Each structure stands twice: as structure tokens, then as C-alpha cells.
From Swiss-Prot:
[Alpha(6)beta(6)] hexamers of two multifunctional subunits (alpha and beta). Belongs to the fungal fatty acid synthetase subunit beta family. Present with 91800 molecules/cell in log phase SD medium. Residues 47-223 are annotated as: Malonyl/palmitoyl transferase. This is Fatty acid synthase subunit beta. The active site is at 186 (for malonyltransferase activity). Fatty acid synthetase catalyzes the formation of long-chain fatty acids from acetyl-CoA, malonyl-CoA and NADPH. The beta subunit contains domains for: [acyl-carrier-protein] acetyltransferase and malonyltransferase, S-acyl fatty acid synthase thioesterase, enoyl-[acyl-carrier-protein] reductase, and 3-hydroxypalmitoyl-[acyl-carrier-protein] dehydratase. It comes from the Eukaryota.
Length: 358
């Protein structure tokens, strides 16, 4: 005889039908099907890749992603005037949205509902996300001047929403294997919990992703002009390391303030931040690199060049910047370890409604 198979579908598995035929060239053995699978392990966003285009192409492509946005973007300008998509396609930053925030009917549900009533707990109990929203007073006006499709107040709504859609299409066309590895990062985590075996409401998903958004901003009220003694950097060892600074850092906190952000890999680490921690720490690692390994008598060391150039630059200005040479700075205004006494009250008392139950 002689039979032959070829991939052909999904359903969750894969399909693989095949035919076998007589040496006479007859149709015997007939049909077939199969349903194999592979050792999956999906992942997620990087809360810092986002940009103009953003899988819009897809948008028109599959009815899948289709309504994903629709709902979100709809429920959006619906609950909180303005549309993600809009912001996703083009970057209307600059004197970005401000909403005419109708002072009629649709006013309240916006210029009140959800907005103003916003509450973060970085400091004190009731700090309603930037006042101004005051009673009547029409029109707020978010606005960066280099790409509002960031400010991580939006970045999230998108990069999030983005993957979601992307997902749908998948299991839609049947590609996701029941048993898989949910993966995240910063926000990239919802980029699974949200997707893969649902949890929240397609809708509400962003509602919070967004909430967590603003929240991740008014916890460190600083420079009522435009900035803060905050941000962060990342770094890769330069001659022997590992945990290398887990304390070379944790030995600066003994005199100033800062923790290790995320720690993606041995030759690459996310450094949370406290201004004079950068221009203050940098030199530290920057001097060790003057070719000096790891040996000798321990204990009576460190805190040397630390308190040397640390209490040297922390006063080298007021609201300085950053530098280079092993360890490059990021471009934000917050962290993920310092907040601490900001948890619960927001992303948790909020995580409550939307997430929990069923």
C-alpha cells in the first residue's frame, strides 16, 4: 500500500487527515484526522515597545480583534470620552485630548463619573487624581509633547488591548493549546490573565489597565512644573558579577534609597530609581570597572566610593538627569517597590470590582 498525511486545521489541537491507497491506485484505508499538539509557552508585552502603527493592520483583517477594540474604544469614549484606537492609529499628543467634556447630558458620566472620582493612595487617603475636575469646570487636557501614546496612562490601554485582540484571532482560528504557559511583565501580565482563559471583562480590562495607569502617576507628586526626582535604568555586568550589585545597590539604600526593579537577566537588570540614586550610584559601578575583580578580605569594605561620589552628586544640582558608560537610563517617572504604601487602596480596592468572583 501507501498512505500520506498533511497538516490541515485546529479546533485547539491540529487536524492532520490522510489517505492510503492500493498498489493498484485504489482508495482504501479511506479518511483520517489526527489531532497532535506542541509544547506551548506564550508570553506578553514589554510596557515599552508600543508605537504608532500598533497591529492596526490586523484590525480590518479579522472580525476577531475587530470588536476587541470596538468594545474597548467604544466603551471608552463612552465612559471616558476619547478613543484608544484614535490614539493608537495617530498620536494626537501635543495639546492632546482635553475633551469638550460636554456640559450637557454626557457631561456627568464623564466630567464626574469615573473622572475626578479617581483616587490614589501614594500619599494620604483621598488624593483624587489631579483636582481641576472640580464640579462644573469644563475640559481637562492630558498632554506630553513627544507622543501621548505613552505617559503609560495610555500606553497600557493600547499595548494591552493590542495583545488581547491578537489573542482572540488566535484561539478564534484555533491555535491555543488548553494547557499553556501564561506570561507577563509589568502590565504584560494581564496580557494573559486578561486573555488566555478569560478573567475580567473585555471591557473593564482596560478600564483598570487604565486605572492602574493614572494611579502609577499621582503617587509621587513632584515638580508642579513637569518632572520628578524619579525614573530608572538598566544594567549589564562589566567584569565578573551576579547579585554583583544586589547589594552593591542594597548597600546604598543603607544611606539614601532604592531597590532593584525587574531583573530580566544576568547581563541586563531593571533598576528602579530615586534621582540621586542614578547620578549618585552610576560612578560606583563606573569605578569598579577600572579593572578590579573579586578577591581579598571582606566586611570592612564598600560604602567607600559609595558615600564618596554619592553625597557628591546628590548635591551636584537639584533635579539632575542621567549619564552613560555601562547602565543606560530609561524615560519615565515612578517605579515598582517604592509605591508599597500605595497598594491596596487603588489597584486592589479597584482590582476588587472587575476582577473577583466567577
Amino acid at each position: 500500500x501507501x498512505x500520506x498525511x498533511x497538516x490541515x486545521x485546529x479546533x485547539x489541537x491540529x487536524x492532520x487527515x490522510x489517505x492510503x491507497x492500493x498498489x493498484x491506485x485504489x482508495x482504501x484505508x479511506x479518511x483520517x484526522x489526527x489531532x497532535x499538539x506542541x509544547x506551548x509557552x506564550x508570553x506578553x508585552x514589554x510596557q515599552g515597545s508600543q508605537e504608532q502603527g500598533m497591529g492596526m493592520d490586523l484590525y480590518k483583517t479579522s472580525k476577531a480583534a475587530q470588536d476587541v477594540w470596538n468594545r474597548a474604544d467604544n466603551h471608552f469614549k463612552d465612559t471616558y470620552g476619547f478613543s484608544i484606537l484614535d490614539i493608537v492609529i495617530n498620536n494626537p499628543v501635543n495639546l492632546t485630548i482635553h475633551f469638550g467634556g460636554e456640559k450637557g447630558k454626557r457631561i456627568r458620566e464623564n466630567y464626574s463619573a469615573m473622572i475626578f472620582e479617581t483616587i490614589v493612595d501614594g500619599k494620604l487617603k483621598t488624593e483624587k487624581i489631579f483636582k481641576e475636575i472640580n464640579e462644573h469646570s469644563t475640559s481637562y487636557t492630558f498632554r506630553s509633547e513627544k507622543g501621548l501614546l505613552s505617559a503609560t496612562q495610555f500606553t497600557q490601554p493600547a499595548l494591552t488591548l493590542m495583545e488581547k485582540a491578537a489573542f482572540e484571532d488566535l484561539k478564534s482560528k484555533g491555535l491555543i493549546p488548553a494547557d499553556a504557559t501564561f506570561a507577563g511583565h509589568s502590565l504584560g501580565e494581564y496580557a494573559a490573565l486578561a486573555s488566555l482563559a478569560d478573567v475580567m471583562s473585555i471591557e473593564s480590562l482596560v478600564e483598570v489597565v487604565f486605572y492602574r495607569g493614572m494611579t502609577m502617576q499621582v503617587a509621587v507628586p513632584r515638580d508642579e512644573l513637569g518632572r520628578s526626582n524619579y525614573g530608572m535604568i538598566a544594567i549589564n555586568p562589566g567584569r565578573v558579577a551576579a547579585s554583583f550589585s544586589q547589594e552593591a545597590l542594597q548597600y546604598v539604600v543603607e544611606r539614601v534609597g532604592k531597590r532593584t526593579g525587574w531583573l530580566v537577566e544576568i547581563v541586563n537588570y531593571n533598576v528602579e530609581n530615586q534621582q540621586y540614586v542614578a547620578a549618585g550610584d552610576l560612578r560606583a559601578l563606573d569605578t569598579v570597572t577600572n579593572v578590579l575583580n573579586f578577591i581579598k578580605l571582606q566586611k570592612i569594605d564598600i560604602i567607600e566610593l559609595q558615600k564618596s561620589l554619592s553625597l557628591e552628586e546628590v548635591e551636584g544640582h537639584l533635579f539632575x538627569x542621567x549619564x552613560x558608560x555601562x547602565x543606560x537610563x530609561x524615560x519615565x517617572x515612578x517605579x515598582x517597590x517604592x509605591x508599597x504604601x500605595x497598594x491596596x487602596x487603588x489597584x486592589x480596592x479597584x482590582x476588587x470590582x472587575x476582577x473577583x468572583x466567577x
